[PDB]
């Protein structure tokens, strides 16, 4: 089972199409492109029929057998795409997959796709069966390679994407690869030129006019002006209030635990421990350094009222409170 990255697929696919291709991961774009790369190569062969069957912990053995009959009685080149469950294959599924895995041959290409399987789910009869015949494509890019991915994707779009610019694009839409790709394509219509310099890219990014994280990232003791700006510019992208509160909560409770651990362990190791420190470190600590143990608390009450005010009258214009909340994370409060 040649384990490989999305980039590596096209080269392997050239040597020879394998028995099965498992696309395991969470990235919508990555999964699709790999899937498209396999099929584009198959339909070239003679793979006319294409099929997709989704496995649930709820699916009947009668559905598995009924499918087998469908695949087994069809005479020519065909393809089958198994869509793995959201959670991953359970005890029962491992068998139904196993039964299907015994339905293979040269003229029946199997493609399984879902998120990453756990080291446990990977010992499973079905998985180990394809382990010599198949190929696994890890569709899941970390902070260091997000820029590298943007540079790679941009270069194939015939783009001269400057490094600072590249970073700008990265700090905005951090992690939404679908966005970074659209953005690169839009940016190409803007400057037919090809030359994506920082000034150019910067102008178009700011002009386009924000991740709910940019609100928080700003809300981290960074001046309120821009957070209030982003907050009132976050109602212009059609962002629900509720989804904002749970973005603030997650980063807020995180500060609570960290500020609580001073003399518990030096800031350094703590960030690793919480696994979110991914540049956010200096910013997170900058936050910790000017927010008092007590400020942090008050901010938790407000968030709570809001959390209830938004769920008790179910329409009390929480936005107001979000404004008021963003103001507490920058200025010293009182006991009123």
């Amino acid at each position: 089972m040649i384990r490989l990255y999305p980039e590596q697929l096209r080269a392997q696919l050239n040597e020879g199409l394998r028995a099965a291709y498992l696309l395991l991961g969470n990235d919508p774009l990555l999964l699709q492109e790999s899937q498209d790369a396999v099929r584009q190569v198959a339909a070239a062969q003679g793979f006319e029929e294409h099929h997709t069957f989704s496995i649930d912990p709820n699916t009947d053995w009668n559905a598995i057998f009924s499918l087998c009959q469908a695949m087994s009685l069809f005479a020519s080149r065909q393809t089958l795409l198994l869509l793995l469950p959201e959670n991953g294959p359970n005890a029962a599924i491992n068998e139904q997959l196993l039964t299907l895995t015994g339905l293979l041959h040269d003229d029946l290409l199997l493609i399984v796709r879902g998120n990453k399987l756990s080291k446990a789910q990977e010992n499973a009869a079905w998985f180990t069966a394809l382990a010599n015949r198949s190929v696994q494509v890890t569709c899941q890019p970390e902070q260091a390679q997000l820029p590298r991915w943007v540079a790679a994707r941009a270069k194939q779009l015939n783009l001269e994407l400057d490094d600072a610019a590249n970073q700008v694009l990265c700090y905005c839409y951090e992690g939404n690869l679908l966005a970074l790709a659209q953005a690169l394509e839009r940016l190409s219509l803007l400057w037919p030129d090809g030359k994506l310099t920082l000034p150019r890219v910067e102008q178009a990014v700011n002009d386009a006019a924000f991740t709910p994280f940019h609100w928080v990232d700003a809300l981290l003791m960074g001046k309120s002006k821009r957070a209030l700006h982003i907050l009132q510019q976050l109602r212009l992208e059609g962002s629900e209030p509720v989804i904002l509160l749970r973005t603030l909560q997650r980063e807020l409770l995180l500060l609570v635990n960290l500020k609580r651990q001073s003399a518990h362990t030096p800031l350094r190791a703590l960030f690793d421990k919480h696994r979110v420190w991914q540049n956010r470190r200096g910013m997170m600590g900058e936050a910790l350094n000017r927010l008092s143990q007590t400020q942090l608390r008050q901010a938790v009450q407000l968030l709570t009222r809001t959390e209830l005010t938004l769920k008790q009258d179910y329409g009390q214009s929480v936005w107001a409170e979000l404004e008021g909340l963003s103001l507490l994370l920058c200025h010293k409060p009182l006991a009123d």
Binding site: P28, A208, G238, H331, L334
Partner: protein, 364 residues
Amino acid sequence: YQVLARKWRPQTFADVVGQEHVLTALANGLSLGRIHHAYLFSGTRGVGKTSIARLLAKGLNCETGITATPCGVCDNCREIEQGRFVDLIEIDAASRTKVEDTRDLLDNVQYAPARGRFKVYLIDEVHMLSRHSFNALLKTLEEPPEHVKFLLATTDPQKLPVTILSRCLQFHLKLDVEQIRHQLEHILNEEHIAHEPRALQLLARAAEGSLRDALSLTDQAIASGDGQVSTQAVSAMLTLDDDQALSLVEAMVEANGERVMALINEAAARGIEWEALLVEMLGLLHRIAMVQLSPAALGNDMAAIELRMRELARTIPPTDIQLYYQTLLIGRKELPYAPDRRMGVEMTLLRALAFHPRMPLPEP
């Protein structure tokens, strides 16, 4: 015979308000013959989603050629603008009563256009298509005929699956209040319809970020102001000037009950929602509390007020600010239990007035 909204429908990329980087992209692509099979337009209901799609369909079909500058005169341009062009097939997944539904219309996709270079399918709220037909659109995008274009548009892009988002070029459409006002000011002038500067602002604010709305709001304003667009007819539907919300607090901390009551009676004559007024006061005193710890507490429309707030922030002790914040806080809670809501407010202030730091009430 002419309603402003209809009369100012944009006839070219050149005159749509402020979505520059969308327009350039489209206009460059339209000049270099670079056009994708399908485009998704997203944004809140109001912005010109469908309207920009027209000008692009209008661009792809103008008899002059494929252009970013369609002449508004040839038959293609005229028909597309009236929305009665053979080839600009327009669906709206939103309604339940279409004659032949999307599935049927999408069936003939591979049929060459009867007129003009492309057969353009403009579908509003694609995220509303029934699954039966949605899949029909999904198959077409995987292998679309070079003579067809899909100009999709949606209010909720999230609701769409990657399958479709990966096969379109998304374009989000962001308006600034001072952007809308300038455009209202212009339309009325070309229409010779009377108007007060405050009036257009009370409208620009109202329409949340969208012209489509501003226009319909102004159309209503006209009918109620019977010809004119006056602050009064506009304040008849969309008030704040009559609000002593800050001049009541000033009057409060200044101690001249005479004024404080005069304000309240004035406010009363206007039919206020008494509790909201106590919110405005409590939300103001809180902000003045903030300008005393950091001067960067002055907001996006704090401008008119600015000097008035800034004066309080320095001339009023923080202890006293807390005292007044508390007195109005308590008076808010007591409100619904008072014998009469106005009475609560009147008495709440009388309490601030009785427990005031400087110049409190006298007794023999």
